[PDB]
From a paper:
One such enzyme is 2-hydroxyacyl-CoA lyase/synthase (HACL/S), which catalyzes the reversible cleavage of 2-hydroxyacyl-CoA (2hcCoA) into formyl-CoA (fCoA) and an aldehyde or ketone. Originally identified in the mammalian α-oxidation pathway of 3-methyl-branched fatty acids, HACL/S has demonstrated remarkable catalytic reversibility, as it is capable of condensing fCoA with various substrates covering a wide range of aldehydes and ketones with different carbon chain lengths. All the enzymes are tetramers, specifically dimers of dimers (α2), where α2 dimer represents a catalytical unit. The three domains have specific functions: the N-terminal domain binds the pyrimidine of [name] (PYR), the middle domain has a regulatory function (R) and binds ADP, and the C-terminal domain binds the pyrophosphoryl group (PP) of [name].
Of particular interest here are the structures of ApbHACL/S with fCoA and D-/L-lCoA. In the structure of ApbHACL/S incubated with fCoA, we trapped a covalent intermediate corresponding to [name]-hmCoA. This adduct is a product of deprotonated [name] reacting with fCoA. In these two structures ApbHACACL/S-CoA and ApbHACL/S-fCoA, the distances between C2 of [name] and C1 of hmCoA are significantly longer than a regular C–C bond (1.54 Å) with 1.8 and 1.9 Å, respectively. Additionally, the C1-O distance in ApbHACL/S-CoA is 1.4 Å which is close to that of a regular hydroxymethyl but 2.0 Å for the same distance in ApbHACL/S-fCoA is much elongated. This suggests that these two intermediates found in these structures represent slightly different reaction states. Similarly, hCoA is partly ordered in the structure of TbHACL/S. Remarkably, in the structure with fCoA there is an intermediate trapped where there is a covalent bond between C2 of [name] and carbon of hydroxymethyl moiety that is still attached to the sulfur atom of CoA. This seemingly corresponds to the intermediary α−carbanion state with [name] covalently attached to hmCoA with an elongated C2-C bond distance. Moreover, ApbHACL/S shows the lowest KM (0.41 mM) toward acetaldehyde, which could contribute to successful crystallization with formyl-CoA and acetaldehyde, in addition to lactyl-CoA.
Residue numbers in the entry:
A (entry chain C), B (entry chain D): -2 to 482, 486 to 554
C (entry chain A): -2 to 481, 485 to 554
Amino acid sequence: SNAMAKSEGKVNGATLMARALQQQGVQYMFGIVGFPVIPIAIAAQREGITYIGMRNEQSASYAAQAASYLTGRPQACLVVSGPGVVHALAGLANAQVNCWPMLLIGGASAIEQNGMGAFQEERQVLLASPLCKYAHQVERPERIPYYVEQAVRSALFGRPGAAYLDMPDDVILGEVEEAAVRPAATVGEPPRSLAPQENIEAALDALQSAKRPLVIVGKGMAWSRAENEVRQFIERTRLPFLATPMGKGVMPDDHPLSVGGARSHALQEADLVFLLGARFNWILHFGLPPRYSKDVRVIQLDLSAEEIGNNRQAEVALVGDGKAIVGQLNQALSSRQWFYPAETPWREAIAAKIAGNQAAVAPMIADNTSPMNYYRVYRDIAARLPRNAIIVGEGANTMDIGRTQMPNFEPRSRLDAGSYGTMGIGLGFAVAAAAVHPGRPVIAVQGDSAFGFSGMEFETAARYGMPIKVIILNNGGIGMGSPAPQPGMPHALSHDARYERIAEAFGGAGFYVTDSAELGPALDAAMAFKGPAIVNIKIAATADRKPQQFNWHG
Amino acid sequence: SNAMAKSEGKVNGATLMARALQQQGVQYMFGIVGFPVIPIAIAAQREGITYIGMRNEQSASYAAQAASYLTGRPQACLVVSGPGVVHALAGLANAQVNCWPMLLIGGASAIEQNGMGAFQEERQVLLASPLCKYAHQVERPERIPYYVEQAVRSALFGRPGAAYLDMPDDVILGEVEEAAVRPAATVGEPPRSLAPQENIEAALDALQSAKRPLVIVGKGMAWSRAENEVRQFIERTRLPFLATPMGKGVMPDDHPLSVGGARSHALQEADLVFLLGARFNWILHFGLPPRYSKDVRVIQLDLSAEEIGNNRQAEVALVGDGKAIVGQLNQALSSRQWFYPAETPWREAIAAKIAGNQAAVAPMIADNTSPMNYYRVYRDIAARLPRNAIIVGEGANTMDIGRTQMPNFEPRSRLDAGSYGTMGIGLGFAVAAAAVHPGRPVIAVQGDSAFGFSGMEFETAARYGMPIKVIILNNGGIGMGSPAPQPGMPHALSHDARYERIAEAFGGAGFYVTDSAELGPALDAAMAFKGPAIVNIKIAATADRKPQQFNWHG
Amino acid sequence: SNAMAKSEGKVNGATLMARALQQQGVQYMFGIVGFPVIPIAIAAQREGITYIGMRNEQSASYAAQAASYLTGRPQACLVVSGPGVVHALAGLANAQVNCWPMLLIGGASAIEQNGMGAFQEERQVLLASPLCKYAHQVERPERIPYYVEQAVRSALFGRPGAAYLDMPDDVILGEVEEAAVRPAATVGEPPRSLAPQENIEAALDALQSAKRPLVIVGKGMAWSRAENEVRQFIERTRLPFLATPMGKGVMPDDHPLSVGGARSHALQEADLVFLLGARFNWILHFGLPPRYSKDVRVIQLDLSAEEIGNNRQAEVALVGDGKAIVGQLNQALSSRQWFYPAETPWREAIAAKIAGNQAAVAPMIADNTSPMNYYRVYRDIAARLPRNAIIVGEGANTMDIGRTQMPNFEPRSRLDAGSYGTMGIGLGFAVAAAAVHPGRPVIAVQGDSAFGFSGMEFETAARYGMPIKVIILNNGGIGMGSPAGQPGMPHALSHDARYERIAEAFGGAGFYVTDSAELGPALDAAMAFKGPAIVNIKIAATADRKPQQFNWHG
Ligand SMILES: CC(C)(COP(=O)(O)OP(=O)(O)OC[C@H]1O[C@@H](n2cnc3c(N)ncnc32)[C@H](O)[C@@H]1OP(=O)(O)O)[C@@H](O)C(=O)NCCC(=O)NCCSC=O
Ligand SMILES: CC(C)(COP(=O)(O)OP(=O)(O)OC[C@H]1O[C@@H](n2cnc3c(N)ncnc32)[C@H](O)[C@@H]1OP(=O)(O)O)[C@@H](O)C(=O)NCCC(=O)NCCSC=O
Ligand SMILES: Cc1ncc(C[n+]2c(CO)sc(CCOP(=O)(O)OP(=O)(O)O)c2C)c(N)n1
Ligand SMILES: Nc1ncnc2c1ncn2[C@@H]1O[C@H](COP(=O)(O)OP(=O)(O)O)[C@@H](O)[C@H]1O
Ligand SMILES: Nc1ncnc2c1ncn2[C@@H]1O[C@H](COP(=O)(O)OP(=O)(O)O)[C@@H](O)[C@H]1O
Ligand SMILES: Nc1ncnc2c1ncn2[C@@H]1O[C@H](COP(=O)(O)OP(=O)(O)O)[C@@H](O)[C@H]1O
Ligand SMILES: [Mg+2]
Ligand SMILES: [Mg+2]
Ligand SMILES: [Mg+2]
């Protein structure tokens, strides 16, 4: 009753944590409650944070980083002591490798029982630390504002990455006087740095000297929110560009300067590559033979000074923020006459290779034979994707062929297995996208193996009214199908699995497709259904991607 | 064709690894293939090792240690580089905490690409090391026999724990001359050590002197295979005994001397406790007030010398193997004639407390009201459990009430959340049990939250023809249900979920139960169905365990 | 004054720690004070603990483990925050590698400043944990008895190793009510375990079947205080034995059964090796060719089950305590007549190899040429070692030649570079020996390179009145000397250095020897000087050890 005297001078750690998270712009918290973190989730809701309770911490820790990428600010994963934290190490590793921020909040057993073999006693900061930019235990409740500020700043500033805060039971429930708690500042936007002017002019001088220049647009530019500057730069210079898998959409994928359909030739024959927030790691084949000229010249824009010149020396280094530096280049271009000319041999070679690759996939796209091939399946899928959708892609062939057949027109609208090649991100990423962008459609296209890692999160989607559209391409195995057996092959799964009945366990709509004639009607119904859906497509066991000169891994 | 000359002088790392695993007694390998470990799973199958391809490495790593516990030998988990290893860290942590052996075999990116940002390059030994007794990279294929011997020996000897072997791609595919490979010795049985004679006699002296003695039978005795010796020891001494959660069955749970129905009174009032392969950690409330007399005398049998006297000093230490040391006690008891007398006040107090607790839960067991309470549901489950079943239990109220309502009569026939309190072990444990003991029934009783962590492994079971019986107690939440919402509560799940439809996705039988009259017939049909099955029981949202003087955690 | 009322109800962390250490048998504490550990050292002295302030924590951490080995109980090293702990990691690593206990107590910056960049803030537990059996922070002063008990037990019990306790400034100075502090039990002697009777009898059966048996006596027997049992065993069986470098003295080095002077032959030709608390690591050349028969049979006695069969399979495993198991063997031998016969080809071969090696070094021992060779120097040094001395040996040729030329007659009386091959242990070990055994002479024979690592601790010895006798064999470099516009060679030091003047800096006696006629008188004067002393011997730059078939490392 409001009539009785109530003591209001004290606040506990759970409440201080919720307030600090909200002050620092955490709007989404993905996790699974239990000892000792129930009060944190409840307190978070009372501050208006959106708590999404999931079915495995592995998926929760993936959702938190996806939500961080999409919002531009660290979002939270909340897990119990012991195995809750160990399950969530999955997401720390993935966020580290992708340079994505996130905040993992792990409960811990009470400090006063350390050494005793307490329930879920664990060396949690020690376990998390090699996967984190920042990891620290909160030893007393009155320092929660200090630590939340420092952790969010460390995750968000510089090269982004994962931050971990350890929350012992006795700190969560510990109480301090309201007026005694020292405030913290609100973490603002990440600082942006610029390049020296001499480097800006040297970059432009290099571009003008090149006979076969190539701009590579990576997901660092998407994280930097540099899409306006990049679009202006490519329109001004008229340089050919190649998008990386999650750099897709920074330039619209239908831009006439994209070399995406001539990727192998463009990398092989360029005499100059301009990396925009993209690494010469495995996704770009290291900047080295056999995928590049041994003498390829490199302009490299990265926020990370230590990344400059990895594997292949950079002729011009542009260390700083992608948006700010491309802004400098656009400003410097306004005093120059040069642009990449409308007709060059390079342009003609690129066009010819695009035409050849188009010719290679044209009969597969047109083939209505059932069981379907991947290109036929994507002909129907691509036709149902609205231009403002968020696309989650996961699998081997399903994901890789999906990457070329599903264009993105706006940045940060594609989430996939990323720089770690992770299976297991799929429905976590979709749940994150639907929480952050409830006004936009969310379509996850998964292989049958991929779907098994996180498919139980469909119940999560249904519970929060998230109308995610899950499309499974089922070839009955990992990368390829398998004849019925003699033991089953290690890569074999269940070609006749009726995964769509999982939707029906949770109030969603399930659709099963074996024949090309069923596929359109199934997708139209799934898109129209007011709720989450699974379309389970039984595809050809031996369907494969377009032949190429080089294996993707090599 | 066998007609053409084939060079047979060379063998590769994958084949050496399969042969060494087979030599060392590894019979089960749970994993998910992909780069770079496909050759290892194929080679393992060629040597006759059973390969179980699962749906998430988290479950595979849990399956591996359950198989090790059941077989008495380290069994393998096989995972890909990068996130395959990070996902499997779950199983390493669980194995460390339960003193269970396992062998995790993690693929790695090729050594010659280290530093370059290779696909799934990761510091895998470093990440695994805090969770392992033994962790090492295999740097050259010709060292494979050496390392597999050493890792298996390290995991199995002494206090058991997890071993990790890192297998780089170029080691897996690297070839050596068969004749050149150094063989390794076959790892035998774990050494057993004995206590000094004076300690054996001091232990019997102390038991003779006690007014209220209590033997506590822990899962170390199950691991030691000490059940014959423990059974002879209790029959000879006639001492009251208490089983720990997975120590159930070492003594038959229906034994007249069990104090399991008077657990709180027995721990509170004992003047002497004899720990048999059981720790004074949280499961036994640390051996300290408020759950024990502050002056409780302790005899402590543990293989780990460092464990002796943790939290509560041991009056008599018995450091060595459970089977061997209880064997010494039985021998020394054939030269004394003491037994604990047939009539004592302690016996009378224990019996009256058991009778009071039976009366306390009898009305709930008998109550046929629907939605049902937990004790009612277990009345039908327990009446249908075969005496040789392997029971997997998982959840909070589901698991803990199932612990009291589901007796075990043989050792090593209960697998549950264990010393780490882990949600997520459920279907991986069930799959391991069906793999190891295909001629025994395997029944997993899970809460609805618990089922969500690993439920996709139902496809794994169906694919290998494992007729696991999954019984879900669904209260719509973690620990308790929740009314309709304002946001849904953090612990709420879906009370109306039709989880049994997941069975129908993979060719199993699904049964849905909301009324007590339905429960009997559904369980009968599920047990009789020649295949895996899910029985989804919608139980009362506020059903709870019997009241107790102390919280289980405190 | 005593007349004033004084509150006495409160005690601080520093005092609680000093009392707990004294309760647990810590008698010696080696360290360097500073923030925040000054109150710990003062409190320690108030409880009667001997505090030895050293000149570098590297040496202090080596002293602590040597004192632990000599006393049989963990002794303490006390260091400041940050670099104090980092400097002491040296000792942690050495203690792990040697299976020696020690307790490192590292001060830490105050918990309330964590995250702020406090003076010497550091992740101290994390840095120490890979080098420790046990490492924990003390988070509250009332837990100090609990943690000190647990750390001492973890260090001392089982296979011994290093323990680390982290002591934050606010825990050291924090106060609690005396009456409120929970006592901890006193850690007693390490538990001893026995082998099964079948293994005892199989060991004696194996020994009787061997044609060329060899018993190897390692420093695990010295740690176990098994010298009486081992001497009885060798006297009873008449088996040839070999001492390891710090196993010397467990058997007296002048025992007629020692194969010390025929080591390479004994290892090469033995058909059966009985390891007594010694590992097949590098010191015993792995139990493998080219140093052993490829079919050598092995009986292995180790406390560590996981060590059994490393590198070479064990035919008979004896897992348990060295004293207890050799006790079992001696007892089983009283029911047998068997002993190794007085005349066998094996004895004849051993004796001829011994005579051959004595003849090889006899002229070097007798050669009075100056500058002297190593064997000539040790002729005079060995003549002047009292039977009860503690010998510290450190260097390459100085240490290795000293090992064969300086016999020990009592166990635990030789301290040397050990299983890690460490330069830097010299004067810390000497200071530890002089603190623990002030009634025994302490003689450190060091190479000129070795001396430079720890030579400043001579001021520590002088300050505490420790009459350590430091003898430096100076060849002007690392392993060998060198001639004097080219740079100095990397191994070269100062052949004409006058190291003995360092004794004179600190009130000790310095002697300089270049001529063989000077050596006897200098050693006699140094031994008689009632204080610490340095005898600096300028030896031949090219003096070397006796030629051998095999390099010591290989
Ligand atoms: C490493 C990669 C960036 C390498 O890129 P590629 O696959 O070689 O190129 P993609 O951009 O996908 O294009 C594929 C080929 O199709 C051509 N292409 C692309 N778009 C088109 C269109 N629109 N029309 C016609 N042809 C096209 C393109 O030129 C390539 O051919 P060519 O020019 O002839 O080469 C990528 O494969 C990748 O990100 N893979 C993810 C791997 C992963 O994480 N797997 C999960 C674990 S698997 C291990 O267990
Ligand atoms: C690894 C070792 C145990 C290997 O032993 P060895 O040196 O081969 O044997 P030792 O016992 O020292 O004996 C040496 C040789 O002398 C013979 N020998 C032994 N005693 C005598 C006597 N009294 N008289 C004559 N000859 C003797 C013995 O049979 C050996 O010859 P043969 O029978 O003919 O072989 C040891 O070398 C060692 O511990 N080295 C430490 C290395 C180290 O840490 N250095 C400091 C770091 S170096 C920093 O890069
Ligand atoms: C890896 C991991 N993540 C989370 C937890 C917390 N875990 C609980 C232990 O505070 S147990 C509950 C299941 C209860 O929910 P349930 O299965 O529906 O059973 P029931 O009680 O409702 O009958 C939760 C989720 C955990 N231990 N380990
Ligand atoms: N604001 C920023 N400006 C420029 N570069 C950035 C910024 N934030 C992160 N980066 C960099 O972007 C790069 C992303 O590379 P990568 O993840 O390999 O992209 P992709 O997979 O698209 O090639 C990282 O090297 C990271 O340091
Ligand atoms: N062969 C063995 N003999 C005796 N004790 C063992 C053996 N193997 C393991 N142990 C010990 O068994 C104990 C198991 O304790 P715990 O997991 O706490 O049991 P519970 O959960 O049943 O109480 C561990 O302390 C472990 O060191
Ligand atoms: N009480 C004990 N009884 C038997 N062995 C022990 C005991 N304490 C330690 N040990 C063992 O003694 C061994 C010493 O081996 P090592 O240091 O290689 O000796 P050395 O250098 O003399 O050959 C270690 O393997 C250790 O586990
Ligand atoms: Mg597939
Ligand atoms: Mg529930
Ligand atoms: Mg020298």
